[PDB]
């Protein structure tokens, strides 16, 4: 039970615990192409791996060869699935096996292989009770991880864990305000626990979603999350809103208030309203205030805005 | 000039409203120094200063091809990888793979061909999805018939249906999980060997439908974040299975072309997160997408000159802060060479250099004329000519 890095480690091959067995090279064929100069620490342990594999050895002593291979390309798939292999036969305990995985996502927290591996063992075993905790570390480290968001979003709906995920979030949010990620963590919280048709909460969201335009006006998490909760039922369908942004306006503006409100005038000319020329223009003005000074790197887009507005709503 | 230098430019730059987080000081580190960048080519300007390195991208692919130092040594168990972006970015920037080459090529991938169907990371090793459509992709760039012939497309369908899920999803590999990319992957593969039953995609559709979320991109699982990799995934899947009207097409566009950075020209691939080398094709490489899409609805508005994203600055990013003098593009100035981004640059300056939708086909070359690579498919990203190569060579069984 030595260990991949030791300064007393010692290659497969010149050991007595595996000299019973042939190691099996690789078979690049003839003319290799895309071929690794693997080192000879590496290569070691894979011929003897392979060995292990292309015989079906089930051996205690081969679950631990796989934990070098493992480390030595932890993206190598066939290797993890060969330890799930020996971790049910062997029968091992899982518990321990479940810190020897805490112990490489926080190594390497951007691995997919490692965490659907961790995936494996909680369902395998029925219990959230750790996770959360851990998934809250590793997104201490790195915040926008997305497989740990992935996986915390899956411990959560699977184990109906919601409770004090909203309140995470807030917490991830003050953090930093621009964490896009927490802002979808929100909306994941909230659309399955009370969805956003309640009146009331969808109001409440509203509100600190302005509150915190206000206070970080050039966040564009902040208000992609106004325009995406709303845009639901109906972004024309809110009247005061297309006022207050106005109203933000001066002490606010950025393209994402100006672009806000192209977006409304197109909706409100789509559920036939009033002064229909009148807001035509109060967009095609906006399209190239956007598309001409406040936002041109996506000029080629608010003239697509522009020319689809008067094709067709002007005729 | 050039939009990326021009004064007015200045005013690009990050506005954090004096409330510092730790996103904004990130952005703020990246746009200073893409700033030294674009400002040295402000002390001289000669000639034709911006120029794609041909030769030097072109020894870096040219050996990878035959041989990897040890550096490498994890993509142990994703080779195929390899093979497709090598071939793909010698084919971009133009150089031809001697035959013999191709053979070798040929008979590598037909190792990593599991017996059952699909392709493993490589020689001896489990078949999975990434490296499968990687194989197909890299034998079509190929081809020749001897590439054609070394899918098993028998097996290759056998395998496609033993991933396949109730809910219409495809897991990534036996025991593994899934995520858009993984449909995306069935579809493209099952697409060019022509090996579509009529019940393979029931569902899938729907199910990739499903991830797209409030922002209006898609994310890799039913309430995931956004994210570029995977949006490009799910449309591409979409378009190949005839259903890019199945999403909500006005804010997923709403979504990409928002994800463009002002300042630093290339795109980043989630909200709020830094610009990046690839996402000039996972993210502008969607725009292609949506034009066929939103084109095939009628929609007169349509630009008939210019993919719907800023393709000036796009190019004068990918050309004047991803290219490492030794060769292979970067991630973003000083994150060092790889054959992946050294492919996903190559991609996306074709899409930002390429434009054509029906029989108008205008191009724009930023930098010298020399800098024109060769056109590349939005969907399975290889030679739109190589495509139909495939697909009508194995519409014939
Ligand atoms: C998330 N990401 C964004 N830019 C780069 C990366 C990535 N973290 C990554 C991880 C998983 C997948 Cl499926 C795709 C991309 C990353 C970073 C660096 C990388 C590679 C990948 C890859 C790589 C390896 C296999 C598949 C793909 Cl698509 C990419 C190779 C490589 O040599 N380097 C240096
Ligand atoms: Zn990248």
Not at chain 1, 245 to 265: C, E, G, K, N, T
Request: charged fraction near 25%; proline fraction near 4%; glycine fraction near 6%.
């Amino acid at each position: 039970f030595l260990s991949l890095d030791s300064p007393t480690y010692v290659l497969y091959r010149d050991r007595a615990e595996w000299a019973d067995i042939d190691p099996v090279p690789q078979n690049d064929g003839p003319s290799p192409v895309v071929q690794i100069i693997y080192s000879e620490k590496f290569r070691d342990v894979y011929d003897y791996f392979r060995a292990v594999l292309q015989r079906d050895e089930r051996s205690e002593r081969a679950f631990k060869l796989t934990r070098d291979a493992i480390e030595l390309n932890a993206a190598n798939y066939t290797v993890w699935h060969f330890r799930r292999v020996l971790l049910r036969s062997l029968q091992k305990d899982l518990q321990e096996e479940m810190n020897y995985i805490i112990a490489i996502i926080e190594e390497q927290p951007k691995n997919y292989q490692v965490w659907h591996h961790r995936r494996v063992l909680v369902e395998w075993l029925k219990d959230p009770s750790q996770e959360l905790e851990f998934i809250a570390d590793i997104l201490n480290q790195d915040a926008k991880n997305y497989h740990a968001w992935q996986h915390r979003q899956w411990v959560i709906q699977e184990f109906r864990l919601w409770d004090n995920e909203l309140q995470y979030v807030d917490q991830l949010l003050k953090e930093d305000v621009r964490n896009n990620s927490v802002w979808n963590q929100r909306h994941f919280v909230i659309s399955n626990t009370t969805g956003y048709s309640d009146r009331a909460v969808l109001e409440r969201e509203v509100q600190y979603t302005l509150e915190m335009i206000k206070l970080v006006p050039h966040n564009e998490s902040a208000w992609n999350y106004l325009k995406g909760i709303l845009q639901d039922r109906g972004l024309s369908r809110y009247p005061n809103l297309l006022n207050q942004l106005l109203d933000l306006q001066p002490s606010h503006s950025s393209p994402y208030l100006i672009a806000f409100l192209v977006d409304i005038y197109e909706d409100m000319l789509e559920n036939q309203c009033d002064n229909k020329e009148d807001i035509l223009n109060k967009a095609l003005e906006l399209c190239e205030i956007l598309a001409k000074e406040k936002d041109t790197i996506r000029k080629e887009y608010w003239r697509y805005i522009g020319r689809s507005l008067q094709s067709k709503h002007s005729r | 000039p050039l939009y990326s230098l021009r004064p007015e430019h200045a005013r690009e730059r990050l506005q954090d409203d004096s409330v510092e987080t730790v996103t904004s000081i990130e952005q703020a580190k990246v746009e200073e120094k893409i700033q030294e960048v674009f400002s040295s080519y402000k002390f001289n300007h000669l000639v034709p200063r911006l120029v794609l390195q041909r030769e030097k991208h072109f020894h870096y692919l040219k050996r990878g091809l035959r041989q990897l130092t040890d550096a490498y040594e994890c993509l142990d168990a994703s080779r195929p990888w390899l093979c497709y972006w090598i071939l793909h970015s010698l084919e971009l920037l133009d150089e031809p793979i001697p035959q013999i080459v191709a053979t070798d090529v040929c008979q590598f991938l037909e190792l990593c061909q599991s017996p059952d169907g699909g392709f493993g990371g490589g020689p001896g090793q489990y078949p999975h999805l990434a490296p499968t459509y990687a194989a197909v992709n890299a034998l079509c760039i190929i081809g020749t018939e001897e590439a054609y012939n070394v899918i098993n497309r028998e097996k290759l369908l056998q395998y496609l249906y033993s991933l396949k899920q109730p809910d219409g999803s495809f897991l990534m590999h036996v025991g593994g999980e899934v995520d858009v990319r993984s449909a995306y992957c069935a579809a493209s593969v099952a697409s060019l060997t022509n090996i579509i039953t009529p019940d393979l995609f029931e569902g899938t559709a729907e199910w990739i439908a499903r991830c797209q979320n409030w922002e209006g991109g898609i994310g890799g699982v039913p309430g995931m974040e956004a994210h570029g990799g995977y949006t490009f995934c799910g449309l591409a899947a979409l378009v190949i299975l005839k259903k890019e009207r199945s999403l909500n097409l006005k804010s997923l566009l709403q979504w990409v072309t928002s994800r463009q950075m002002r300042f630093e020209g290339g795109f980043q691939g989630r909200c709020n997160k830094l610009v990046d080398g690839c996402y000039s094709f996972w993210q502008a490489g969607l725009l292609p997408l949506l034009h066929r899409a939103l084109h095939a609805q009628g929609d007169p508005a349509l630009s008939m000159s210019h993919w719907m994203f800023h393709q000036q600055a796009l190019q004068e990013y990918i050309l004047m802060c991803c290219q490492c003098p030794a060769g292979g593009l970067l991630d973003k100035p000083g994150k060092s060479r790889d054959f992946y981004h050294t492919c996903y640059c190559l991609s996306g300056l074709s899409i930002a250099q390429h434009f054509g939708s029906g029989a108008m086909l205008h191009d724009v070359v930023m930098g010298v004329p020399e800098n024109v690579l060769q056109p590349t498919h939005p969907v399975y990203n290889i030679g739109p000519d190589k495509v139909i190569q495939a697909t009508t060579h194995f519409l014939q069984k």
